[PDB]
Amino acid sequence: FPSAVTIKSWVDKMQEDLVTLAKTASGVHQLVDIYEKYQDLYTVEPNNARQLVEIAARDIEKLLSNRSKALVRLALEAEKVQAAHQWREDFASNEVVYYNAKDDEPGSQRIKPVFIDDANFRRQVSYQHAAVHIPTDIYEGSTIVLNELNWTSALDDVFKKNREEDPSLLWQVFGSATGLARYYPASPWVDNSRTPNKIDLYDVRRRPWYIQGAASPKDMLILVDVSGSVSGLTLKLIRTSVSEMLETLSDDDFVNVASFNSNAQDVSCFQHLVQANVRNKKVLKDAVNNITAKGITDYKKGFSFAFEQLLNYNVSRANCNKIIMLFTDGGEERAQEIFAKYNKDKKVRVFTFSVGQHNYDRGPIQWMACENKGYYYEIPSIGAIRINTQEYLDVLGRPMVLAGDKAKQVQWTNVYLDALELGLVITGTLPVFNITGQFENKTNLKNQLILGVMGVDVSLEDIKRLTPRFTLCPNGYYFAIDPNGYVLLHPNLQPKPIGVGIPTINSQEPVTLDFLDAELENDIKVEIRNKMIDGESGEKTFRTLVKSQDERYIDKGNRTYTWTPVNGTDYSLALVLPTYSFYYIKAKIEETITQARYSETLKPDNFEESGYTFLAPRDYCSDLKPSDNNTEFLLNFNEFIDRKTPNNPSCNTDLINRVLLDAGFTNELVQNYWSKQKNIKGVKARFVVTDGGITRVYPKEAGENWQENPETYEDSFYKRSLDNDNYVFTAPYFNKSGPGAYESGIMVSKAVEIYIQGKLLKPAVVGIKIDVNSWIENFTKRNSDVMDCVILDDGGFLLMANHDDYTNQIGRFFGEIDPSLMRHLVNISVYAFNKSYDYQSVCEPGAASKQSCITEQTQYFFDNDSKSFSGVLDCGNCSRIFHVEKLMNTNLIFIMVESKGTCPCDTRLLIQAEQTSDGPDPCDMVKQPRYRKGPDVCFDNNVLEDYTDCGGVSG
Ligand SMILES: *[C@@H]1O[C@H](CO)[C@@H](O)[C@H](O)[C@H]1NC(C)=O
Ligand SMILES: *[C@@H]1O[C@H](CO)[C@@H](O)[C@H](O)[C@H]1NC(C)=O
Ligand SMILES: NCC1(CC(=O)O)CCCCC1
Ligand SMILES: [Ca+2]
Ligand code: NA
């Protein structure tokens, strides 16, 4: 084995050759000189984080206030119209005229719309009437529905006025308590190719934006009868009913499921109330779908357990509605002592359900439902499950109605996918009360229930339009959260459902992504989250690990967080801004000739002498649309520049001027430096990616192999080389599909830095692609049999070797071609690994299309800053020798080891690719939960409530 001095000399020579080639071919110094030469076509402007955060929060507050005004006006008009309405049953003679969706009878006339095409809504809509959706099980000929249409036909004028006030208005909707939902503008309902599995089961009374406004958060505890007398069809009905009941809960509600058969016990691992999010609800459903019926019944022990679990106060709760929902069939036990012991003051409601078809006594069940301020329900078949499990929100809404005026508060819901194919939206909510005979105080019996719920939608793209990012760098961004910790805005939130567990095969759920799951978790992150949840203002500068856009690299970077609360609402907004992005360049190019030249630069027929130009698809104009092809997008851009005046009445001037300035600088670089040395031996392509959104590859034929995102803010190598302070080598993918490795080369990148007035700016990155053949020629200058020589980057991705068998698989993770060496050096502190979870992932349904899944990812990086390593790879029965050695000014390492053949010891390979996992364990996250702050306004237990109408004594 050669000594360490010769190894150091070899590594020094290789580093010198590689770094010299990259530096001379790229042109970092030339680009920096070109940037600094003018200093008169642009101006440096600061990015004051606090002012930007305050302005964005103010804009968001103003938008939400506008939506709240619209909701209040709609609710007032609806209440006033419903108050003065005459009941009638003569709909045969006089008909109600309305347009119905999901179509194509006496008393109803239908309307044929025009359905023009609109750009905001991604479908065809009409602005002359409001569509009406009536669920399948609701017959549109009944007198209740006819009266509903008759008195709701007055909302169209206020809808039109609302849309005239703010043309950017999205869907407006009134969901009635009778089942029908009237929305504006008119548009046909949804259908998917009329497949047999495309039945419309939509019911507005079950939508979360309706439930969150129909009542207040609760502390439900589902008590399930699992005695022997319930086995059969009724047990299956009970399981389905419990699942449907759990489907009505949200994040603000807390729930647990218990069972009793001569003994009361929990149904799962929780043992107490849990926040009832997607994971906990999935656990509860899976636990309740595995219960068996046996033993005698004992209501006293079960109710004692249910009351005991509601008096904990040692855990996180809601303290707003303690309700016990019993699911049973029948019995003869009333258990007066338990109710007189645990609630003399009727502080806990008891709802009772009799499930199945049987001949058991239902008297004591109704007595339990009527004594406590509860209700009694019957579920004899699967058909009644949908309706007879969402009716408890009428009982829970009586105190809110009795409170009345002080309960008219606009609430905003979670982020969810619109059912009419609009993306990610949030819905405002305001209930409407029934005030007929209010000035005479006559009935006050049917006035304890709400007419319905009104809603208005705001798209997340409207939120993103209020937080511009192109004055920042590719590493700075906004993000906002709600007091539950979930994310309202983030670059890592995608229009996909949240995955739960491993998908096993034989828009209903919300998109709830926590802040600590959209990024890498850290103690400072936890402190910042807890501090901004409580509506504080702060700023914190620290150092943290950042994952690359392509989930294979992790780099250490300095970050700064600045968070303020959004006034009026309950959201908090932050702004992550790296230290080198406190200043930006604005273009002061106000002159015809220079702009004309910089625009002529982009002509597609100049690519011979200007490289293969790309262009980021940005909103440069209102009339310009991102074409997603970039071959005609640049043509449209050139046409607009050629014909439209540079005044830009409807277009940003800053973005256009920035693009022109970057085009001029990049063309100067290409024409003055790259074009001189046309052919370089080891270089296959020379590229440059700028901040304004222009990327260039000099050999026009090399552009066809440039498979990079035209949006320079989405290029992983751009961000990676901005974070690092040296040359960055990017490893090609293993095989995928398409040219690579030998065809393309190896990408080396370096960011340019300028000090124009003592201020650090990084406005571009450049680099080259290296031919594999010449690199191998200079590496051997072997296919040996007793010595292995490999080169890896920070990440363990093989870039070159000497066996000519490793070099065929270039870019593959080194832990799959030589497991023992990688495992050994992963604990010599030369490599460190981070494991994280991704929830918005799709996996092939395994051997239990695609389904949502959770994928665990692992990334590797250099742990200890030591330039040399040594030791012996004693695997047992042999002893290999290795001299791992890093390279300077580069993220590469050089390894020389004994051949694998000499040691028969074979170990298991370790994989860096994502693994379809099922964790983390939910039974542990509830013992030490995160920090949350629930709502304070709670409406319950009003003494004027009648509650004389239970479900038993009336029949
Ligand atoms: C709210 O509405 C008013 C009137 O249309 C408008 O001036 C204001 O700009 C709107 N809010 C925002 C954030 O645009
Ligand atoms: C509002 O209350 C009155 C009086 O009890 C009742 O007749 C009417 O049906 C209620 N409104 C609706 C839409 O049910
Ligand atoms: N946002 C509410 C919708 C879909 C939903 O209920 O999620 C129904 C009414 C009209 C707009 C769409
Ligand atoms: Ca029983
Ligand atoms: Na909320």
Name the residue with the closest Cα to ligand 2, atom 12: 451
Question: Could you give the CA distance from residue 44 to residue 493 in angstroms, rounded to a whole number?
Answer: 32
Distance separating alpha carbons of residues 24 and 41, to the nearest angstrom: 27
In ligand 3, the atom with minimum distance to the C-alpha of 457 is 1
877: left (phi over 0), alpha (psi -120 to 50) or beta: left
* Whether the bond into 167 is cis, omega within 30 of 0: no
822 lines ligand 2 (CB under 6 A): no
Q: Are 213 and 429 in contact (CB under 8 A)?
A: yes
User: Are residues 702 and 685 in contact, defined by beta-carbon separation less than 8 angstroms?
Assistant: yes
Q: How far apart are CA 663 and CA 661, in angstroms?
A: 5
Residue 836 Cβ inside 6 Å of ligand 2? The answer reads: no
Dist. CA 447 → ligand 2 center (Å): 7
Which ligand is closest in space to the CA of residue 296?
4
Dist. CA 750 → ligand 4 center (Å): 74
Q: Which two tokens stand for residue 14?
A: 């290789």
Cα-to-centroid distance, 290 and ligand 4 (Å): 19
Yes or no: say if 687 and 695 are a contact pair by the CB < 8 Å rule: yes
Phi and psi at 386, nearest 5°, equal: -65, -40
Q: Could you identify the atom of ligand 1 that is nearest to the CA of residue 66?
A: 1
Residues with CB under 6 A from ligand 1: 59, 62-63, 66, 165-166
CB 326 within 8 A of CB 355: no
Strand 915-917 relative to strand 181-184, pairing: unpaired
State the SS3 of 722-744.
Answer: HHCCCEEEECCCCCCCCCCCCCC
What is the distance between the alpha carbons of residues 509 and 498, in angstroms, rounded to a whole number? 8
Between CA 575 and CA 564 the distance in angstroms is 9
Instruction: Identify which of 837, 851, 833, 835 has the alpha carbon closest to the alpha carbon of residue 918.
Output: 837
Q: How many helices (H) and strands (E) would you count in the chain?
A: 24, 38
φ/ψ (deg, to 5) at 812 = -70, 145
Q: Are 272 and 207 in contact (CB under 8 A)?
A: no
DSSP for 573-637, please give it.
EEEE--GGGSEEEEE----HHHHHHHHHTT-GGGHHHH---------S-SS----SSSSSHHHHH
Distance from C-alpha of 171 to C-alpha of 121, rounded to nearest angstrom = 9
Task: Evaluate: CB of 448 within 6 angstroms of ligand 2.
Answer: no
Structure tokens belonging to residue 742: 């030998």
Per the CB < 8 A criterion, the answer to whether 558 and 543 are in contact is yes
Is the distance from the beta carbon of residue 648 to the nearest atom of ligand 2 less than 6 Å?
Answer: no
Residue that is written with structure tokens 């959706």 in the block: 133
Which protein residue has the closest C-alpha to ligand 2 atom 11? 434
Closest listed residue to residue 616, CA positions, set 731, 714, 527? 714
User: What is the rounded distance in angstroms from the CA atom of residue 13 to the CA atom of residue 7?
Assistant: 10
Per-residue buried b or exposed e for 4-29, using 16+ beta carbons within 10 Å of the residue's own CB: eeebeebbeebbeebbebbbebbbbe
Ligand nearest to the backbone CA of 60: 1
Ligand nearest to the CA of 488: 5
Tokens 């402007």, residue located: 45
- The answer to whether the CB of 764 falls within 8 A of the CB of 752 is yes
- The ligand 1 atom at the shortest distance from the C-alpha of residue 165 is 5
- In order, the DSSP letters of 85-129 are ------TTTS-EEE-BSS---TTEEE-----EE-SSSSSEEBSSS
Q: In whole angstroms, what is the distance from residue 97 CA to residue 149 CA?
A: 9
Distance of CA 909 to the CA centre of its chain: 33
451 lines ligand 2 (CB under 6 A): yes
CA 463 to ligand 1 centroid distance, Å: 14
CA distance 319 to 337: 25
Please list, in sequence order, all residues whose beta carbon lies within 8 angstroms of the beta carbon of residue 18, skipping any fewer than 6 positions away: 748, 887, 890
- 407 C-alpha vs ligand 1 centroid, how far in Å? 26
For residue 419, the ligand 3 atom closest to its alpha carbon is 4
* Method for this entry: cryo-EM
Q: Are strands 538-547 and 832-843 parallel, antiparallel or unpaired?
A: unpaired
**Cβ atoms within 10 A of the Cβ of 611, count?**
28
CB under 6 Å to ligand 3: residues?
171, 173, 181, 183, 207, 418-420, 427, 457
| Rounded Cα distance, 143 and 139, in Å | 10
- The preferred substitution site among 102, 132, 183 for testing ligand 3, maximizing ligand atoms within 8 Å of CB, is 183
Terminal CA-CA length for the chain: 94
Instruction: Label residue 179 left, alpha or beta by phi (over 0 means left) and psi (-120 to 50 means alpha).
Output: left
Q: How far is the CA of 413 from the centre of ligand 5 (A)?
A: 5
Nearest to 134 by CA among 107, 103, 172: 103
Contact 491, 463 (CB under 8 A): no
DSSP helix, strand, coil percent of the chain (3-state; round to 5): 30, 25, 45
Give me the torsion for CA of 434, 438, 444, 445, rounded to 10°.
-30
227 is in an annotated binding site: yes
Ligand with the closest atom to the CA of 458: 3
- Residues 158, 74 contacting (CB under 8 angstroms): yes
**Two tokens, residue 608:** 């011979």
436 lines ligand 2 (CB under 6 A): yes
Q: Which amino acid residue places its CA nearest to atom 7 of ligand 2?
A: 446
Query: Rounded to the nearest 5°, which phi and psi values hold at 44?
Result: -90, 130
* Backbone φ, ψ for residue 67 (5° rounding): -60, -40
For the CA of 147, the closest atom of ligand 2 is 13
Structure tokens at 628: 């997603």
Question: What is the secondary structure of 848-915 as a DSSP string?
Answer: ---EEEEEEEEEEE--S--SB--EEE--SS--EEE--EE-TTBSEEEEEEE-GGG----------S-E
Question: What atom in ligand 1 is closest to the CA of residue 60?
Answer: 13
Nearest ligand, measured from the Cα of 133: 3
Question: Cα Rg for the chain, rounded, in angstroms?
Answer: 33
Q: Residue whose CA is closest, atom 1 of ligand 2?
A: 434
Ligand 2 test: best mutation among 86, 442, 446, 447, most atoms within 8 Å of CB? 446
- DSSP class of residue 670 equals I
Whole-number Cα distances in Å, 97 to 53, 109, 126, 131, 286? 50, 4, 16, 12, 47
Residue with tokens 């549109």: 140
Asked if 328 and 290 count as a contact pair (C-beta separation under 8 A), the reply is no
State which of 120, 207, 421 you would mutate to test the pocket of ligand 3, scoring each by most atoms of that ligand within 8 A of its C-beta: 207
Strands 116-117 and 124-125: antiparallel
The candidate with the shortest Cα–Cα distance to 767, out of 832, 715, 833, is: 715
Q: Is 381 annotated as a binding residue?
A: no
**Which ligand 2 atom is at minimum distance from the Cα of 447?**
2
Distance of alpha carbon 162 from alpha carbon 169, whole angstroms: 8
Probe target for ligand 1 pocket from 165, 166, 456, with the most ligand atoms within 8 Å of CB? 166
Structure tokens at 684: 């296959």
Q: Which two tokens stand for residue 525?
A: 């992150």
What resolution (Å)? 3.1
* Contacts (Cβ under 8 Å, ≥6 apart) of 156: 129, 130, 184
Question: Rounded CA gap, 303 and 298, in Å?
Answer: 9
Residues 6+ apart with CB under 8 A from 41: 587, 588, 589, 594, 661, 664
Q: Whose CA is nearest to atom 14 of ligand 2?
A: 451
For residue 259, the surrounding DSSP H or E stretch is strand 256-260
Residues whose CB is less than 8 angstroms from the CB of residue 675 and which lie 6 or more positions away in sequence, other chains included: 609, 698
Cα(227) to centroid of ligand 4, in Å? 5
Closest ligand to Cα 932: 5
Contact criterion met (CB below 8 Å) for 328 and 354 = yes
CA 20 to chain centre: 44
